[PDB]
Design a binder for these strands. Structure first.
Ligand SMILES: [Cl-]
Ligand SMILES: [Cl-]
Ligand SMILES: [Mg+2]
Ligand code: NA
Ligand code: NA
Length: 153
RNA sequence: GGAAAUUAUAUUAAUUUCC
């Protein structure tokens, strides 16, 4: 039905329609490792403070980094149920990384699984080779992406 | 039809805007 270019443009439109973002393989990897740096020890941050922590540190290598773009990455993890959220009446909620997502491998798998879930919600059928290219810019994460698809079905 | 920024406690709702 759709060629690869069409599947890709429709995938990123569906991601952006949920207030989520993928910043590209290198920038997304660094954004997620900064989320881990802030939260792996169980610190409880508001969205404001997590976004500040990650943006200003990305900015030198990735001048495109904004509150908006990094907020959209944090929203992808939020939609993925990666955070334990503490509500505070008439105040900002605090967020902690659930214990099972306090390594890069586990957090990155949950992140990837959520983008595949968005593809499934949007009716976009994308093969593991295209997923590896989209999320990693290489063909060395095909088996990883295949595993994620099969665990979602 | 697509994109960016900005706001918010968002499994999200809007605003503004340079195609
Ligand atoms: Cl498939
Ligand atoms: Cl935007
Ligand atoms: Mg505005
Ligand atoms: Na939104
Ligand atoms: Na969450």
């Amino acid at each position: 039905h759709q060629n690869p270019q069409q599947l890709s443009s429709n995938l990123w439109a569906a991601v952006r329609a949920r207030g989520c973002q993928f910043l590209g393989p290198a920038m997304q990897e660094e954004a997620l490792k900064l989320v881990l740096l802030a939260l792996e020890d169980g610190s409880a941050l508001s969205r404001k403070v997590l976004v500040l922590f990650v943006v200003q540190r990305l900015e030198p290598r990735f001048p495109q980094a904004s509150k908006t773009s990094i907020g959209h990455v944090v929203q992808l993890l939020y939609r993925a149920s990666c955070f334990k959220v503490t509500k505070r009446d008439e105040d900002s909620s605090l967020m902690q990384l659930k214990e099972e997502f306090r390594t890069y491998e586990a957090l990155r798998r949950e992140h990837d699984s959520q983008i595949v879930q968005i593809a499934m919600e949007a009716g976009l059928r994308i093969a593991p080779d295209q997923w590896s290219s989209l999320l990693y810019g290489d063909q060395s994460h095909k088996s990883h992406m295949q595993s994620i698809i099969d665990k979602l079905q």
